[PDB]
Amino acid sequence: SMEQVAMELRLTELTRLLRSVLDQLQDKDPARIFAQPVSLKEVPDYLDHIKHPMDFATMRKRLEAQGYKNLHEFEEDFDLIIDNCMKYNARDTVFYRAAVRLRDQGGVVLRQARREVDSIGLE
């Protein structure tokens, strides 16, 4: 049916958009600060303060497994990455400043992705 065709087209187009967003976000982090989960050997107290850890590898795994229903769910995981980094690290640190940089750049990319969801009619 055409309802199935439209649903499958919205799924594949949202996936294409989210993959482009995630690639642009990762390209802005060549130091790989947000690429992978934090090592508990290097940071033993991380889970004493961060209850819901998040990183770009976890997001990519969720994206490619069809785990994001809409752009808002993807935005929530990106905000978790930024917020956890700003909560764990003191403000006068290279890691907190990297989160502020990615929050600036990421906000612009995500608002452009919202304009594309609206233009395409994805949600």
Swiss-Prot record:
Protein location: Nucleus; Chromosome
Tissue expression from the record: Highly expressed in testis.
Domain Bromo: 9-113
Cross-link Glycyl lysine isopeptide (Lys-Gly) (interchain with G-Cter in SUMO2) per UniProt, renumbered positions: K41
Function: Scaffold subunit of various histone acetyltransferase (HAT) complexes, such as the MOZ/MORF and HBO1 complexes, that acts as a regulator of hematopoiesis. Plays a key role in HBO1 complex by directing KAT7/HBO1 specificity towards histone H3 'Lys-14' acetylation (H3K14ac), thereby promoting erythroid differentiation.
Quaternary state and interactors: Component of some HBO1 complex composed of KAT7/HBO1, MEAF6, ING4 and BRD1/BRPF2. Component of the MOZ/MORF complex composed at least of ING5, KAT6A, KAT6B, MEAF6 and one of BRPF1, BRD1/BRPF2 and BRPF3. Interacts (via PHD-type zinc finger domain) with unmodified histone H3. Interacts (via PWWP domain) with dimethylated and trimethylated 'Lys-79' on histone H3.
Record-given protein name: Bromodomain-containing protein 1
Organism field: Homo sapiens (Human)
Full-protein residues shown: 556 to 676 of 1058
